[PDB]
């Protein structure tokens, strides 16, 4: 009846539904003045209303953004206030008419940017998957180092054995200290990242600038790190062939070119 209602000249009762999902956690909002139950999901009513500006599909990712307006107290947007969540918040938009149990999917995407122009409002800019095609695609260089992030699909190195679970001893503004890591050689954890559970099955990740003794340096500060929460810390690969094989014994998968050639052409001037 959704299509029939759209074609109807007197039963038009538009209502737009938004679904923000991050793994196992979902946030449901509706633009009407009362909650709507759809597919066993109830959508909350935001005091003040939630509205968008329209959907544009012109083939230009930079121009085809989707804008959401909502109060500054919106739960899903509140997360971005202090620090952007590590994972992207997928957004799905449905369209349905009051009194009908059928809805149609209109827009699908993820959060691109969030800002709070006024205390009584917040503007969210949503981007589609098409915008991820503007970055280069070379991803190849003939250099000495590995040119591969430890654990990627190219290194084929399993980090689960190297996982270390610990409770930090003391947390400071920029340094998190723990005695368990003090037993490892300096720089063992350099290049690794720290992941811990925020809510449900979602974890927030932070990279490590440097590891020295019992003190760990966290890039961008330690804000948001629970002082007593359980933390998982993985090591980091420098990328050198000696580092790759002595520590991880992954030399066969070494993607770097240590000593094949640095400059030698076959159309130079004098070989000697």
Partner 1 sequence: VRINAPELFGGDKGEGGLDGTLDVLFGEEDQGVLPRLAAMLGGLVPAFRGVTTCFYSGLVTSVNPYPKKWEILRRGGNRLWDGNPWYPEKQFVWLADGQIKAMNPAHILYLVYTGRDFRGLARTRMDEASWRAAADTLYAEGFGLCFEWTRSDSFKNFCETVKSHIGAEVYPNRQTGQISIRLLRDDYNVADLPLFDEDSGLLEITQEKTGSTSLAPSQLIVKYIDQIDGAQRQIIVNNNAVAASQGRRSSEEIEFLGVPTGELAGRVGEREMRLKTTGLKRYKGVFDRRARSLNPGQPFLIRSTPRGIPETVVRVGRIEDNFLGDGKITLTVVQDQFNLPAT
What, of Fe ion, partner 1, none, does residue 209 touch, CB below 5 to 8 Å by kind? partner 1
Among positions 24, 33, 47, 138, the unique one binding partner 1 when judged by CB under 8 A: 138
Is 47 an interacting residue with respect to partner 1 (CB under 8 A)? no
Among positions 220, 224, 226, 229, the unique one binding partner 1 when judged by CB under 8 A: 220
Is 91 an interacting residue with respect to partner 1 (CB under 8 A)? no
Beta strands, E only, 143-244 = 164-166, 170-171, 175-177, 193-199, 202-212, 215-218, 231-233
Number of residues in the chain: 272
Among positions 163, 170, 207, 224, the unique one binding partner 1 when judged by CB under 8 A: 207
Mask: binding to partner 1, 227-256, rule CB under 8 A, as x and -? -------x-x--x-xx--x-----xxxxxx
Q: What angle do CA 122, 124, 126 make, to 5 degrees?
A: 170
Is 145 an interacting residue with respect to partner 1 (CB under 8 A)? yes
Is 199 an interacting residue with respect to partner 1 (CB under 8 A)? no
Mask: binding to partner 1, 150-179, rule CB under 8 A, as x and -? xxxxx-------------------------
Q: Any long-range contacts for 126-135 (C-beta under 8 Å, 24+ apart)?
A: 126/65, 126/66, 126/67, 126/68, 126/91, 127/61, 127/65, 127/66, 128/61, 128/64, 128/66, 130/61, 130/64, 131/61, 131/62, 133/61, 134/61, 134/62
Is 180 an interacting residue with respect to partner 1 (CB under 8 A)? no
Count CA atoms within 13 Å of residue 45 on its CB side. 9
Q: How far apart are CA 186 and CA 225, in angstroms?
A: 23
Q: Which residues are near Fe ion by CB under 5 A?
A: 146, 155, 237, 244
- Applying CB under 8 A, the span of 34-42, 164-172, 177-185, 202-210 interacting with partner 1 comes to 202-210
What, of partner 1, Fe ion, none, does residue 158 touch, CB below 5 to 8 Å by kind? none
Among positions 21, 45, 71, 72, the unique one binding partner 1 when judged by CB under 8 A: 72
Q: How far is CA 7 from the centre of its chain?
A: 40
Instruction: Report which DSSP code applies to 180.
Output: G
Nearest approach in angstroms of CB 257 to Fe ion is: 13
């Amino acid at each position: 009846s959704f299509n029939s209602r759209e074609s109807s000249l007197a039963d038009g009762q538009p209502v737009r539904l938004y679904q923000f999902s991050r793994g196992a956690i979902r946030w449901s909002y509706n633009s009407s003045d009362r909650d709507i139950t759809y597919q066993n999901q109830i959508f909350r009513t935001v005091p003040g209303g939630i509205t968008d500006n329209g959907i544009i599909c012109s083939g230009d990712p930079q121009s085809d953004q989707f804008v959401i307006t909502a109060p500054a107290d919106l739960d899903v947007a509140l997360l971005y206030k202090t620090r952007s969540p590590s994972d992207a918040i997928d957004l799905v938009v449905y369209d349905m008419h009051y009194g009908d149990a059928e809805a149609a999917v209109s827009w699908v995407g993820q959060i691109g940017d969030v800002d709070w122009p006024t205390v009584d409002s917040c503007r969210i800019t949503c981007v589609s998957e098409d915008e991820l095609m503007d970055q280069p695609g070379l991803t190849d260089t003939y250099c000495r180092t590995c040119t591969a992030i430890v654990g990627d699909h190219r290194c084929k190195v399993n980090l689960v054995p190297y996982r270390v679970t610990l409770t930090p001893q003391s947390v400071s503004a920029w340094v998190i200290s723990s005695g368990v890591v003090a037993g490892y050689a300096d720089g063992w954890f350099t290049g690794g990242y720290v992941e811990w559970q925020v809510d449900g099955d979602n974890y927030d990740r932070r990279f490590i600038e440097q590891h020295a003794g019992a003190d760990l340096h966290i890039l961008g500060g330690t804000e948001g790190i629970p002082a007593g929460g359980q933390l998982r810390v993985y090591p980091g690969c420098d990328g050198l062939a000696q580092t790759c094989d002595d520590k991880f014994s992954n030399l066969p998968n070494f993607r770097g070119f240590n000593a094949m050639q640095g400059k030698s052409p076959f159309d130079g001037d004098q070989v000697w």
